[PDB]
Amino acid sequence: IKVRENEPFDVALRRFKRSCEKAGVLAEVRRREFYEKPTTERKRAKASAVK
Amino acid sequence: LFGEPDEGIVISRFGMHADVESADGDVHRCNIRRTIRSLVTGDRVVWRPGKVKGIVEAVHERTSVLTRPVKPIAANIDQIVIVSAILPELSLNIIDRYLVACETLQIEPIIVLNKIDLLDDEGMAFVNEQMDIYRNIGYRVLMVSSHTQDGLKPLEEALTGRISIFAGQSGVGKSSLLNALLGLQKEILTNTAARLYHFPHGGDVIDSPGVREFGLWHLEPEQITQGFVEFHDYLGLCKYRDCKHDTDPGCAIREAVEEGKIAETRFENYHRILESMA
Amino acid sequence: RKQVSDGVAHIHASFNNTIVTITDRQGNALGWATAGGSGFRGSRKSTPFAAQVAAERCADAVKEYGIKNLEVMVKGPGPGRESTIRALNAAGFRITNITDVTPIPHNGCRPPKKRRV
Amino acid sequence: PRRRVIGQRKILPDPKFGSELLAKFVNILMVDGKKSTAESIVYSALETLAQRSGKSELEAFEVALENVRPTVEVKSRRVGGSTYQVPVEVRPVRRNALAMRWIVEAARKRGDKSMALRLANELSDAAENKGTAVKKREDVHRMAEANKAFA
């Protein structure tokens, strides 16, 4: 969030806490999320992560 | 199967068979033997009846002057009619692609502008100017309407004694002209064995709609070049090896373009064609 | 509008671009420059560059407000929260602290759904 | 050298200094494959440098080479085809090697008699940190510490 940037300003030193913030939820709202793809899911919903 | 050898010209590709119009003129739907394979519509064939069904067991497809992938369709096509209208989008490279090919093949283009009538005073003019680039480049333009099938006599007369063909894009009223020419519609279209027809003023014409909505065929680099002879002259212009017709210091061809000594389109087309084979 | 020489670098990064407004800490807007306003209107604005310049072009023209202390308040996710923050702190400032800002959406509206090729 | 990475080989030095610095360097010019006569025209320069350094021929070089040599660089090997751009410390075998080469590469085929001069004229300039070779120290370090965004 903050790294007391007194200097840094290209990097932010942040990639944690996305679950209501940044790219996590914010990319999926006014862009389409389908229903003939998470219809795979029913069966497929836990496998593609770390990857 | 065997029968009695007789000559014929293959009037039509009968799908499964080929239909042969005999030397007499008699059309015989003929089989085509496992033994022969160099057959196309237009071939003069030895076909035989049975002892209609015929059988074909000799052919005569004369030298290349057009292909698709890269396989001759016929021969004695002394002119290629590159017929266009704008459907379903179009480009200068597309006519030129055909031109480059006409030029390569050493089959004469007669560039036919369809829908001339469709094209307004400004539009017709613009298109004529474009048609002129090619024309200036050497490929005569005949203003026709696809629909109205105008300039039909100048075309016909160009057809006399020779065989011609219909090239372009998604039923760009090529199909329409063909109908006029024939004087019988045998095609419309809008948005290698096929069938052949014979002209009265002399000469012949070959058609297929399938060709007409377009994709395009395999080719080699030199041919594209052949498509543009002005480049040869530019090749000589810088060095005893001019870079490669394309930019690099001392690329005359490139320079000639920079100058506009060559039209840009030729170079551009040279590229669309070049890329596709690759 | 206003100054205190402490500002905020609102970086409004944007998909094919990145627009940047430096704002007083207080508010206003003080400059703005985009990334697809760092001309670009292609893959070009879809460059970080687009941003670099975006921010830069904003970040200079806010120091009218004396701004030289910025929190950066990163907004937008365009190719410009590197380049743009570049050109926001470093654009006549000492960055005083960074942050990224967001709410709990619950929306209304339907966005698009059109494509399928 | 993906398995086990490397510097230079069969080098020959000075019977009067024994300096490797001078050795890898005197050598560089070879692709004449014989510093049984290479070395000579550089000394006239390093002599004029010797004076210009206020030192000897050996240490005429030294000064100019320490200007020339890079202290950092950026390095490539292309990891993944990746555009390495991160700042790195120029390895000694390079420091030296590249540097020595850089001085030498700055007095080339020219326009008048005697390299003696040509070299002389390169040499003090590299002594003064405004040689070509030293400017490669002072250009490689400029690219360093200002790009690190890409991997």
Next chain:
RNA sequence: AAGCUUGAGUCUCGUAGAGGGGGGUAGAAUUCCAGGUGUAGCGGUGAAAUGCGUAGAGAUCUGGAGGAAUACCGGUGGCGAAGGCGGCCCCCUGGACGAAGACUGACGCUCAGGUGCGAAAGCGUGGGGAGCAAACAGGAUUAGAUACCCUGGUAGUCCACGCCGUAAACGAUGUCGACUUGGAGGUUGUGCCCUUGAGGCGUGGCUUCCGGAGCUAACGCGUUAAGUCGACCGCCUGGGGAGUACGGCCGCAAGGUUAAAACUCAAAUGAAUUGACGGGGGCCCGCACAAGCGGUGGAGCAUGUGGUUUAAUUCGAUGCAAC
């Protein structure tokens, strides 16, 4: 034929939960909607472009709405018949344990018809609209584009209900129940030890996997069955021809629902090996990169070839290799 209760059932009492109706509502937002500063953009993309802003927009700041819409709830948690269920009240409510007797006292199981309910589109048919997307379209490349690519939108979404009865409405596991691996795991009740936190520690009921035998073709499954049983209910009948015509039917309709033939083939499949390719990936090496150095090639020039000539310019020469 009468009994038992024991099943069931019932009635006695936990406990968790996104089950529901119907609605309370919350706080955000999507969006709506507006300037200022601010400033040329925004915008977009393959690559762009239409679009848009420049009108100050976007940006940003400043203001609110509109109508719409609600993470982490996210736990082998939990709830649901499923079809399916997580934004905060209330209700109305559905469904559900552990722990209690008991009683009723077989109230048991399962179901063709039949039937409820049955994802969505759709639709009827109106809602809804703050907004989106078939259809349908600009730009827009693109071989062709009419594709990519971009600048939009009714149904329907965005609303109410009716109107399908079909959704790979799928472990393609029917029901119910019982019977069949150790192990190491879950939840949720609850027993117990100092309750050793409620704990620590039994046991249920329930969840995970592995889990054997077995089974299976095999994959695997393997008690989560894909292992033993039963009833019950429903299934398969070589492949196509066919949720569809005929036909008949439901439905406003979409259309369902229902529901063909000839024809047609000597065939249709599981799982498995051993494979090799992958607009795969994951992993290394090598003047291959890489770090240099130089080379070739260029001029002049050769040699061979090409090419041409030549009568021949003699046959064997071809990534790399004419050489």
